[PDB]
């Protein structure tokens, strides 16, 4: 199933290439750099595709529980909506057992996104409900 573009990129080196940012981390930097390299090269800088996969996966886990690392990510009824490159990288993480380090991947792909697009975000956690006076005062 996995497309040869991902196999060629994978067996080739990617970390030494030019990126928007020198990323700090151990092994988990590669899983995000490879997502960024697919989004930049083959999908033509459609970064939010993989950002949706995380938003997809956050619900998929609620449909299966935390015992989703066991499952081969290619063959599955629930993973059908996922991107092939994202599936390949979840499979690589399944092989290496780094799947417990997931959120450190999305947090880094978000950095590369926010720097390539140059979109620094600023989260807000205000009140038990929002309001109009403070939405314009804050």
């Amino acid at each position: 199933v996995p497309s040869p573009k991902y196999i060629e990129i994978y067996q080739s080196d990617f970390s030494r290439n030019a990126y928007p940012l020198e990323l700090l981390g151990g092994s988990h930097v590669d899983f995000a750099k490879l997502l960024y390299s697919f989004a930049d090269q083959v999908e033509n800088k459609k970064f939010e595709v993989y950002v949706e996969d995380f938003k997809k996966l956050d619900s998929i886990i609620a449909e299966k529980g935390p015992f989703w690392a066991e499952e081969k990510i290619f063959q599955s009824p629930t993973f059908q909506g996922l991107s092939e490159g994202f599936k390949f990288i979840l499979g690589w993480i399944q092989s290496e057992g780094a799947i417990d380090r997931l959120e450190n991947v999305r947090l880094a792909y978000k950095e590369l996104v926010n720097e390539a697009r140059k979109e620094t975000t600023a989260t807000v956690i205000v009140a038990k409900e929002p309001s109009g006076n403070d939405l314009a005062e804050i």
Binding site: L21, E22, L23, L24, G25, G26, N104, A108
Partner: protein, 108 residues
């Protein structure tokens, strides 16, 4: 007054804590103080002992260790450790952070 965060705690071993940083652009100096938000009310001070290549901060804890949990946020003061100093300290015992202890300006 706005504080500045760098990341959250990765794990702890008793008095020790390791840090997972966010926004990898940001750095921290070597022997600075770090303020951990165990809760919105209480705050624990700590010192940075060492740093790593992956991006992490080995930290030694100095107060309210038992309240620490994983997933808590960290903030940085941007200065070395320092205590209140002067002639207004002769009659009272203190904690090495300056916290006067009960019993039955300048920094340094």
């Amino acid at each position: 007054e706005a504080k500045q965060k760098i990341g959250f705690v990765h794990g702890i071993d008793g008095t020790i804590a390791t840090i997972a940083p966010a926004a990898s652009k940001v750095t921290v100096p070597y022997n600075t103080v770090l303020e951990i938000a165990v809760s919105a009310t209480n705050i624990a001070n700590a010192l940075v002992f060492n740093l790593e290549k992956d991006g992490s901060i080995g930290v030694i804890l100095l107060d309210n260790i038992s309240e620490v949990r994983s997933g808590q946020d960290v903030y940085a003061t941007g200065s070395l450790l320092k205590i209140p100093v002067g002639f207004h300290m002769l009659g009272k015992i203190i904690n090495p952070l300056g916290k006067e202890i009960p019993t039955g300006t300048k920094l340094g």
